[PDB]
Amino acid sequence: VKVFDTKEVQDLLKAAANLNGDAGNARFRQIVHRLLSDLFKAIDDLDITPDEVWAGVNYLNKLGQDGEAALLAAGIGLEKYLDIRMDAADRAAGLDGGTPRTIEGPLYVAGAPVRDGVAKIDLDDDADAGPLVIRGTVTGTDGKPLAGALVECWHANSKGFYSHFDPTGAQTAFNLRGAVRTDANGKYEFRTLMPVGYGCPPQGATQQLLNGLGRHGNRPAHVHFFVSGDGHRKLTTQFNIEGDPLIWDDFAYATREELIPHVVDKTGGAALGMKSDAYKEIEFDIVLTPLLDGRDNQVVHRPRASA
Amino acid sequence: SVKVFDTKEVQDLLKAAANLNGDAGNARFRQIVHRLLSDLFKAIDDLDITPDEVWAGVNYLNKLGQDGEAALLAAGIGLEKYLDIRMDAADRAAGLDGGTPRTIEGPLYVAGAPVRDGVAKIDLDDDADAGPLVIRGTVTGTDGKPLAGALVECWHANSKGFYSHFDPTGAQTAFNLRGAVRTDANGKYEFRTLMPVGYGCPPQGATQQLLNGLGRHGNRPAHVHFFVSGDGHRKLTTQFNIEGDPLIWDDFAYATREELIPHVVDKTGGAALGMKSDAYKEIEFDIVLTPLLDGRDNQVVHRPRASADA
Ligand SMILES: [Ca+2]
Ligand SMILES: [Cl-]
């Protein structure tokens, strides 16, 4: 049977979204009506059974109980899709030359202390992670260095865990999370340890759905960035650690070819405060896009953790 | 607004996300996920849903599951009724629409109630504000013959609108206002209980938050839930509404049916029946069950349900 087009179903959808209601939140009602209508049509078209529907409802309970809705948003490509739509708007406006955006992911933590020029961000010992310097210059698309720009980063430890989200025990607040104001020449530097890739909580809702699809829930090793500066839009980006076997098989679809810098082996680490003389260096220069008529049309407000 | 949905990049992303080109797996699940994700992506593109709006929706899903309310929302936005609409249409096409009308289960069934022969008294806790109610009827097949030994289960709320096992103000006795009766040799069942009152969604919960955003209330008229089952017959999920409730045709869960509003009769003689006052109310609620088609019940629903020990 197919019932979606009947007046009873169409009236039910109008009532459920309160389309004929008194003045209210029209945009919200419009969105709810569209999503509900699409869901009802999919159920009808695919003959989705009550048992199947209630299994989906149960999944939503687990997803929220696990606090994983934003992790799922990354894992089924919704987060990348938002970037696709933002990139398409920038392309239509004729923008080029900026460092490409990529997904934020769900693990930013607000409030890290801001240092001038350089920050050492590994607060907790991690014997399995070697020392890493990340440094670069921030410019605008005209090539000029941006002084006093805010460069923020966050990344995982050798076990794939982030501070404020570590299920094995609390890390020091802001471990492997940093904020630096660029110097007069646009330079920033973080002294940290090398990340290893993230994986979804194995018993959580995201991995349960991925298992049902036959997909893994792993990311290659990477470092997240927010970069902002006077006169410029806020950039959300990342880089991947060169050579990681998952670099082009990220469960969150976030890799971009311009965001895979070279890793260089260096010496002299002790004089930089590193835990060994031998360390790795990544030079990651960043180009910000100017504001348009003084506005940033792509900055995203979403729930974010704090200290 | 940009329109990117129909691009190869987006269609490839959807195929990858649902693993359509992966190894042999759960094809049905991949098909459903791909359709729902595709529809979601298309809606975002068509309505220019912004990242801020999407992340507010994601945040809502976190709250919904934290509150344990996904099945309450399913009722409140009409999805639970929609499943009944589809089951009713299938029954009409199949000629299996001759029994008592179905309505929604709702999310508050609890397995494990003690079963009594013929008559059960189910008000285990006193409730000064609720008067005594007898519910009784006969269970027959569509051919009119009584069904002996059929299982009639019912559950309903107290005078504050709360159900046992789901009461936030304090623990009711296990199985308060929940019971099961095996019909007698002539198909008869009877419950002795107290009159339910309707109720609203948890006011701070995710379902009411969404309903508030839509400008809708989250209330149900007073009602009583039933499962009725028996050998050789399909399992009925139904309810009745208490006659005269002002919300009877303004139920947030869309569950009212005109065939399921029985007359309420005033009676006397309650004390002899173990009720707390001479005056009481009686509701007759007869049940007509449909025989199995081809030996299997193709409308019975499996979903997560609470359970408890008496
Ligand atoms: Ca530790
Ligand atoms: Cl932590």
Ligand SMILES: [Zn+2]
């Ligand atoms: Zn990450």
Ligand SMILES: [Zn+2]
């Ligand atoms: Zn109910």
